[PDB]
Amino acid sequence: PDQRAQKKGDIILGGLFPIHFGVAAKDQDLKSRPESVECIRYNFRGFRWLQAMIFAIEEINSSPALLPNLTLGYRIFDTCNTVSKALEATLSFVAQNKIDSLNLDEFCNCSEHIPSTIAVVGATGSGVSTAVANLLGLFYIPQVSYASSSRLLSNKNQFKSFLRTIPNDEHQATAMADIIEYFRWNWVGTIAADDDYGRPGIEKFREEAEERDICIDFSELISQYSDEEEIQHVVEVIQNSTAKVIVVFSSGPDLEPLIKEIVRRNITGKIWLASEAWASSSLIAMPQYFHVVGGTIGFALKAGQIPGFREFLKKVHPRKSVHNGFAKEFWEETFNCHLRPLCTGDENISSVETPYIDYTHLRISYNVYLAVYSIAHALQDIYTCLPGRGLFTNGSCADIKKVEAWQVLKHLRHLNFTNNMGEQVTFDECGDLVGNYSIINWHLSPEDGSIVFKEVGYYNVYAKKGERLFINEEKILWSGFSREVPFSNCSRDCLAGTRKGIIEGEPTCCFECVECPDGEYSDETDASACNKCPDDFWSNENHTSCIAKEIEFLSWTEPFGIALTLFAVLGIFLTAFVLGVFIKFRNTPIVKATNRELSYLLLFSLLCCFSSSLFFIGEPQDWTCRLRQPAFGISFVLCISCILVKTNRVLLVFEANLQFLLVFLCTFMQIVICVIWLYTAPPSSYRNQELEDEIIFITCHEGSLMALGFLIGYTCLLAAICFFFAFKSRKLPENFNEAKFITFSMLIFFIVWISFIPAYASTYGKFVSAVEVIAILAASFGLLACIFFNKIYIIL
Amino acid sequence: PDQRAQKKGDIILGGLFPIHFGVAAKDQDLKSRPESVECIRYNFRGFRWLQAMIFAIEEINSSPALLPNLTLGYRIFDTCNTVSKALEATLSFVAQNKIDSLNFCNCSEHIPSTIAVVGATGSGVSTAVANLLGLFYIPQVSYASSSRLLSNKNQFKSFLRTIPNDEHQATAMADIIEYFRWNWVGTIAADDDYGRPGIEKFREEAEERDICIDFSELISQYSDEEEIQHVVEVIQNSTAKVIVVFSSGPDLEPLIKEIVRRNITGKIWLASEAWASSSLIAMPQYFHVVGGTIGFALKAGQIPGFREFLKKVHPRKSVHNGFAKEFWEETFNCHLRPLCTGDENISSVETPYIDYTHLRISYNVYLAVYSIAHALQDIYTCLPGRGLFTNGSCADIKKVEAWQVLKHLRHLNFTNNMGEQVTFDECGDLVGNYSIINWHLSPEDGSIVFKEVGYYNVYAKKGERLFINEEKILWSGFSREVPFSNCSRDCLAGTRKGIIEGEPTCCFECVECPDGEYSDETDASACNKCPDDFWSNENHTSCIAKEIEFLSWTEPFGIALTLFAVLGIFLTAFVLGVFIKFRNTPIVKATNRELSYLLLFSLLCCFSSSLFFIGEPQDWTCRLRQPAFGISFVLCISCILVKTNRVLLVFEANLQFLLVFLCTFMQIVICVIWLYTAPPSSYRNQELEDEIIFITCHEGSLMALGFLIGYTCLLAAICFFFAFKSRKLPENFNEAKFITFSMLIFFIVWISFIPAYASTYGKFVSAVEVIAILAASFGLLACIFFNKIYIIL
Ligand SMILES: O=C(O)[C@@H]1Cc2c([nH]c3ccccc23)CN1
Ligand SMILES: O=C(O)[C@@H]1Cc2c([nH]c3ccccc23)CN1
Ligand SMILES: *[C@@H]1O[C@H](CO)[C@@H](O)[C@H](O)[C@H]1NC(C)=O
Ligand SMILES: *[C@@H]1O[C@H](CO)[C@@H](O)[C@H](O)[C@H]1NC(C)=O
Ligand SMILES: *[C@@H]1O[C@H](CO)[C@@H](O)[C@H](O)[C@H]1NC(C)=O
Ligand SMILES: *[C@@H]1O[C@H](CO)[C@@H](O)[C@H](O)[C@H]1NC(C)=O
Ligand SMILES: [Ca+2]
Ligand SMILES: [Ca+2]
Ligand SMILES: [Ca+2]
Ligand SMILES: [Ca+2]
Ligand SMILES: [Ca+2]
Ligand SMILES: [Ca+2]
């Protein structure tokens, strides 16, 4: 390495910064002796970090309070983000230690003029720094990095002298998961880089997503040296996916070919998530690409303050700066000339617009500044060590004249001081720091069309999980110009009345919506299953909620019921035209039956025949006391018996007072059978019919219907017997044709049941009570009309 | 590095082998100057590999057909599975190139420079060594590094290997998992460069093949007790019986010991190639925890004369090999506490150094050494004018450089002692077959043995690369039944799936298919919808056909209707069939025999129409039952109604015979007009009454039938009005009274069956209609002919 930044001093430090983005991308066939690689691109941020470190060292050497008489030198080389260059620089650093503490088999002699460094500033990448630390751990030389946040460097078993001044990015995955949870999504992507920074950083994110039940569509890995095949495959995978959110864990140059290919293919409508590595890189954030990476949300560190730095940055000159060997190359790259046209030392560094001269926040430079002062404070603590109170064995103390690397590492292990801003800086036993992570968004400046970063929130690491992040949605512009929150889900959420259904070969986050069948209802949206038991209710047409069932039965409240009751009471009134108001019964001339008894009985007999029809009307169980367990046969057992005794009285004169006792004996069998039935045998009722539809049915199904059939058959047989007995003498019309019309009156009763048997068998709306009551009422009207034909001839 | 194996020569080769499994674990507080670490336990497999390399070098140096005038030396250090120890050896190897490349430094010229370095046994150690060796373009060949991270040529330029990569092993394990009926498995990996890269591919394959993973954990050799306890608790609190392990011997040893201490059984263990045959875990005392373990092994090789060279090791005569002094002490438990002598036997003590059945890593080392020798021979034997360098130039064997050796090694193709061809790929990788082994218990020795139960191919198409013999696999060491490892039992027939919240797709519930649809396959995603003409079974297994009821003639009610119809036909033919004498008969008032056969055939046609009314609407394709609706209401009644018309005409006052056919004319023309206006159709839908399909008839403009019935009723009413004043007096065989009584019977029959028409049992409207028609016709014929059938003549 001919180019170097070397300054002499009593104590020598080591530094490694990236000045070039990469090396020549050429393959060697090894046909001849290989040569060293050559740089292709130039970096300006590394020069800024180098200048900041030089300024910090100079301020240390210019502060008598920090160090009275100690002068510190430095040796800085270039890495170019290459493992080989950093390994060569580290080997050159540890040559004095290598010749002495190593290679004991053979005698190795070297010049004493070369100095020995006490510490080496770590590299930027997480892979190069890993190799540098692995090689440095043999000699116990401390190494402090400023940009490595990989977890693989946190293992103290493999690395013993590695420290970092950048907060660990393990909380970055948690913050991204919380961001995804806040803007509720379930379909996301995953793109990482094949290195030591991307692969370990995606496992934690995937674990957090799985813990939060977040589905991942595709996961891909990219690299800077990959050719067109992998880039095309990744582009095809991205295009063939419906995920609108992509998580990217990569660097600037690593992601540059993918961004260029996407821009060439004009792929838009995607959301880009940026980590701290590439949230502010100038290689990706360009106006020409603003239509592909617009509205990008990224992570950034906490800004620092370095007084007297802007003025120092303008003092660089390629002629009066002999200590710095990179000034000439920086000048040539900035002014784009040779030292084609000749260039003198009379330009202005602030004319050309380059990132070296303009900046908004110093994060990595502040990290290097803090590391340099941490080393200075460790040296000061070594100098100020008091006898009798030390960190070595038996209370020993070190000598400032002869300081070894292991003593510096031991003193750096237990370090605590105050920052220039009043903060407290100390090193944890894992060699890691804790700091805030900030959220930034990309916007377009209307003035000159330049990409700018705006703060729209922050992440806290000193609070309990759940409320560690704050965000302001009103200041976030999605896709660069859109304000509404984009919709990125595998499928639409199920609405009310629909349930979920599995699709074969698909994850849990993807499903289908299926309408629930009858009898099932669901109120909450996206319900796993619908309620099955409506608690004696019915499912609605839309299955939104439950509906109470309807009770349908014959009642007097309905117009049909009130009309039937009015007809019944009218019939009761029409049989009271003699019962209620009676004509003279003494020496009655119209009827030969002078005696009031056995003839006045027919009045209240017909009254009971009419009144008994009111048992069937209304609900069977409407009243508790009047539950009417016997309902059917009571009407028959009295009315048929009265008809039979009347027919017997009529026939005794023609076919054939002890008659009153004689008529009752024949009908006594009906009454004793009914009394046995209605008391000894307790009838029941059927509460609900077959429980299928929303229309419920109530009915009174008397127990032991065979007894009812038997008693009806007995009554019919007795009626037929009396009809047959009356038939033999009804042909001859005598005595006001009395016997001639009773036969027709009771034949009306017979033909009522003949004409209403299909109504008994089948009825509309389960109204067997209605047909029964109308049949018995019509029979009662017929009997009443044809039983009092003698009164219409003569009033009295 | 005082402990080393050195032999000088014209050409020097480097080598690294693991002689110890690790180093002493102690924290450094930096109170004083740190000292070098020490290795605690000895290893015999690394010593066997070193002996194999020495034997190969000696065989090459004692062969005239290979490098006849060249002498080969070696320089081998110790690694102890430590990164720092290997880095020290790597730095010592590149001491000569340090002055030439870096930066002045003066060094003695007596020290030689190695041209090749044998790769390390580990993965991260090999990566660290190759990172430093790549600067000087020094070729390096490894024998046990199978990590994919070494397959990147951009970072590594002088790395070669003779072992298949881990991608094939992961694919084979995925195929094994897919072969068995398991979908709920675990995952355990080691925090190193061998385990983590070897689990991403396996997880991707499992996700592609629709395989769920229960838990994933990382373990390490230096992990404390808390991590081990957490891993054990996670494993115990799981329902998975199959566990995938990607770790080495010492890495997995603490976890195995902790599991044994807790006496955890009933688990299926899958072993990677790294620990499928390690003696640190395969112990009888742990057998009841690792019984029936399936592991992967490579293809063994044959090295004639190896055992004889192994059985002649001596700590005194082996001046070149300085590692025998410690090996003798370790294998005999002595030192040079009880004093020892150089007269013991090596065969006696049972050690893995001499007790072995196959050689896999040693064969790899032999192949690597022979590949290097073949490259050197090709360098020596190259002819001018056809060299691979620029302008056809060829190198000189007197002065050889590392880059030339690497270039010739990149293009290598030779043959083995077993008649096999060995080449090098563009990435320096090799391919080979795989073997599957199972762990069994010796019946008398009591030790763990390996049995071959199958193999995996790499030269065949996808899906036809694995062969498994189930008749030799013994699960759990003694069990025979195939283990069952599923999240939940599969749904039976007629039962569909149901989702559980916050659970993977591999876990679900079984819910019975509701009524109206069926599923005839197990683990059905959804219940298949039944067809229109089929209904779901009681058990919902499949669909069943429905039934149709149409009052067939074979029905008891149908045959009853038939028997009444034929009885009526016979009774009416008793009068019509026989031509009884009607000469000067006084039964009929009219002398002419006409106006009597009219009724006789009208009743017959009415009976025929009533009989034809029943049956299917489409029983006969010639004509539908439509006339059965019409004529039965006009031909049956109006022709009979002619007698009532003539008798009312007589009461009002061969001349009126033609004047009483008008009613039939108007009724038939109205029927024809209705039929042509909107012919009746047939309704065969289910009408949402029930699941049973019913057949019925529907006609447009149904009010026409009501109007026809109303016209008939009005005609009968006007007949009653006309005959009311004539029926009071009885005369002429009481014909008027009997006709009035017959028509009253007709009215009472028509109005008696009104609620049956309104509602009928079983939707048998046709049965009600035919019953009413027959009853009315029978009463009519029995009552109008009351005096015409009382006496035959
Ligand atoms: O660990 C790593 O590799 C990244 C490197 C990196 C970070 N921030 C940067 C800014 C510019 C350039 C590089 C970086 C943070 N950690
Ligand atoms: O790459 C690695 O780290 C492993 C190391 C290893 C393999 N086979 C072994 C047998 C014994 C000891 C160690 C090993 C295969 N690849
Ligand atoms: C980080 O943000 C929180 C939020 O108030 C707070 O602790 C502080 O302002 C920031 N810095 C540190 C060191 O916490
Ligand atoms: C997307 O799916 C998630 C799954 O939990 C859900 O919470 C979210 O509401 C869905 N998005 C929309 C817009 O409904
Ligand atoms: C376990 O699940 C798999 C998933 O397809 C299935 O093939 C297998 O039959 C199930 N096991 C049993 C015993 O049914
Ligand atoms: C690997 O197995 C296959 C099939 O059994 C066959 O090619 C041969 O036996 C093996 N091949 C090699 C190169 O050993
Ligand atoms: Ca770097
Ligand atoms: Ca970070
Ligand atoms: Ca799938
Ligand atoms: Ca090793
Ligand atoms: Ca392998
Ligand atoms: Ca979960």
Residue numbers in the entry:
A (entry chain A): 22 to 360, 392 to 708, 722 to 861
B (entry chain B): 22 to 124, 128 to 360, 392 to 708, 722 to 861
Give the text the authors published on this PDB structure.
Human calcium-sensing receptor (CaSR) is a G-protein-coupled receptor (GPCR) that senses small fluctuations of extracellular levels of Ca2+ ions in the blood. It maintains Ca2+ homeostasis by the modulation of parathyroid hormone (PTH) secretion from parathyroid cells and the regulation of Ca2+ reabsorption by the kidney. Like most class C GPCRs, CaSR functions as a disulphide-linked homodimer. In this study, we have determined the cryo-EM structures of CaSR in the fully inactive and agonist+PAM bound states.
To obtain the structure of the receptor in the agonist+PAM bound state, we collected a dataset of detergent solubilized full-length CaSR in the presence of PAM cinacalcet, 10 mM calcium and the compound TNCA. We have observed two active conformations with overall resolutions of 2.99 Å and 3.43 Å. The agonist+PAM bound structure of CaSR displays a substantial compaction compared to the inactive structure, including the reduction of length, height, and width. Moreover, their width changed most obviously because there are four interfaces with interaction between the two protomers at each of LB1 domain, LB2 domain, CRD, and 7TM domains, both VFT modules adopt closed–closed conformation, and the TNCA and Ca2+ ion composite is bound at the interdomain cleft between LB1 domain and LB2 domain. The cryo-EM map of active state presents a distinct density at the ligand-binding cleft of each protomer, which enabled us to unambiguously model TNCA. Two sites were previously reported, while a new Ca2+-binding site was found at the interdomain cleft of the VFT module that is close to the hinge loop and abuts the TNCA binding site, and interacts with both LB1 and LB2 domains to facilitate ECD closure. The bound Ca2+ ion is primarily coordinated with side chains of D190 and E297, carbonyl oxygen atoms of P188 backbone, and hydroxyl groups of S170 and Y489. Our CaSRagonist+PAM structure shows that TNCA and a newly identified Ca2+ ion bind at the interdomain cleft of the VFT module, and they both interact with both LB1 and LB2 domains to facilitate ECD closure, therefore forming the closed state of the ligand-binding domain required for CaSR activation. The agonist+PAM bound structure shows a TM6–TM6 interface, contacting at the apex of TM6 helices, which is a hallmark of GPCR activation. In the agonist+PAM bound state, the loop of ECL2 is pulled up by the interaction among E759, W590, and K601, leading to the movement of ECL2, which would raise the reorientation of TM5 and TM6 domains during the activation of CaSR.
